[PDB]
Amino acid sequence: MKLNISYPVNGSQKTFEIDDEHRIRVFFDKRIGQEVDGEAVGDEFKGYVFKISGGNDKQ
Amino acid sequence: SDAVTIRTRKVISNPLLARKQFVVDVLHPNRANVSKDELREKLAEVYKAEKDAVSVFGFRTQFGGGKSVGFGLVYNSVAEAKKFEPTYRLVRYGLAEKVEKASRQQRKQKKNRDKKIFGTGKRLAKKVARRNAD
């Protein structure tokens, strides 16, 4: 699953591939603008506050 | 032997285009016709011009030969003649060279391909590069 992630106070952006769909469910059933918790998102995302901003489906 | 004997008729001075315009009738018995370059150099000494401010075109030969009727322009200077002459006539006289250009269909197809691109196209060039790379 691709993750186009941006840090905008310094204008940086990068893509992740976060597999193991049994833990991606923090994003599931969540709309644009809602807040997820990065603790379950990954081990390196300790204390990050990710806001949903968009995305592209298959096709 | 030749007896080109150029005659000039219907001369108006037109300083609006800063030129003189006239019909030119050539009597060339025992000859096919007279070249436009020869007309230009003849009218050059007729009007004390520089031979590049003189332009001629038209020049229909009458039936049976011996006489031809055409059009002539004598401008006041070379650059001023350059500003008002058509590009094809300037190329005809060598004062200008024809520009390099593809055919009209080629230009139209290029423009239609240009319509299908928004922006410069460098963004999409690198995006399609990184996609078709795998």
């Binding site: - | 108006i12 037109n14 300083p15 609006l16 285009l17 315009q21 008002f84």
Partner: protein
């Protein structure tokens, strides 16, 4: 047709332009302006077909956009600007002035004039009304609006415009016994004097006009323009002085010139 038309086909242009049939499909369509398009002469038609100063449209445009030509004191770089009846066009180079008036055959003749009379023009009063703030104004035939007119000025009167400052100089009343000029119909180009005007309530007042050679005709009020008094006009007239010589009369004179 979903909006206004922008092209004028050849054979649908007014016949007095004398455009030749075979040179193309289109005539210069006059733009919107001071005169109705049926009663206008495009500057391109005047400068190319009348004066032969230009050979084609591109040279017409090159003349116009360099401001060598000015109409009513203004440049008008537009190729098809609708010049019209009695308008004075100044071409400062060559020091030439023209008044655009029809010859007696119903087509605009090239009328050479001096500078002093190139300085002014005449306007036929088309309307008299009270504007905003109760200010009267007159409307001329060329769409000019002149505020504060003389109260004696009425409809179908004539005014003289200074043409450098569009201000009223003097007027002429529409009355019996005064030289007029027919500006439409088959009497276009005729010059004569009012005999009498017939009323005909409900439309199209008629006027009876007598020529210099005592030739009498009648015409609609809409097409009658006052230019001055008998034998003293405010406009120089072109060759012929609006007489309408008959066919055999033109024949014997034209042989007098050429065929002897």
């Amino acid at each position: 047709a979903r909006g206004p038309k922008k092209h004028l086909k050849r054979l649908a242009a007014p016949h007095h332009w004398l455009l030749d049939k075979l040179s193309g499909c289109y005539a210069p369509r006059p733009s919107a302006g001071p005169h109705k398009l049926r009663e206008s002469l495009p500057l391109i038609v005047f400068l190319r077909n009348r004066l032969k100063y230009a050979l084609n449209g591109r040279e017409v445009k090159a003349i116009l956009m360099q401001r060598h030509v000015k109409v009513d004191g203004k440049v008008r770089t537009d190729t098809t600007y609708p010049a019209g009846f009695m308008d004075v066009i100044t071409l400062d180079a060559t020091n030439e002035n023209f008044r655009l008036v029809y010859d007696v055959k119903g087509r605009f003749a090239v009328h050479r004039i001096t500078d002093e009379e190139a300085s002014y023009k005449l306007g036929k009063v088309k309307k008299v009304q009270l504007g905003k703030k109760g200010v009267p104004y007159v409307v001329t035939h060329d769409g000019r609006t002149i505020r504060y007119p003389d109260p004696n000025i009425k409809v179908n009167d004539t005014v003289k415009i200074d043409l450098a400052s569009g201000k009223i100089t003097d007027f002429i009343k529409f009355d019996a016994g005064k030289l007029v000029y027919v500006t439409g119909g088959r009497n276009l180009g005729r010059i004569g004097t009012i005999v009498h005007k017939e009323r005909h309530d409900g439309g199209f007042d008629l006027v009876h006009i007598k020529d210099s050679l005592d030739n009498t005709f009648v015409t609609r009020l809409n097409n009658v323009f006052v230019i001055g008094e008998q034998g003293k006009p405010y406009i120089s007239l072109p060759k012929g002085k609006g007489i309408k010589l008959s066919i055999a009369e033109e024949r014997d004179r034209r042989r007098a010139q050429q065929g002897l």
